[PDB]
Amino acid sequence: XDXXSQXT
């Protein structure tokens, strides 16, 4: 999900 929330 970007953000460094998860890669995706």
Fill in the amino acid letter for 1.
X
Q: What is the CA radius of gyration of the chain?
A: 4
**Phi and psi based region of residue 6 (left: phi greater than 0; alpha: psi -120 to 50; beta: remaining):** beta
CA distance 3 to 7: 8
Q: What is residue 3's DSSP assignment?
A: B
Written as six digits, the tokens of 5 are 């929330």
User: Tokens at residue 7, please?
Assistant: 């890669």
| Alpha-carbon span 3 to 5, nearest angstrom | 5
Rounded to the nearest 5°, which phi and psi values hold at 5? -90, -50
Question: What residue type is 7 in one-letter code?
Answer: X
The residue count for the chain:
8
**Token pair of 2 as six digits:** 């970007």
Give the H/E segment covering residue 8.
none
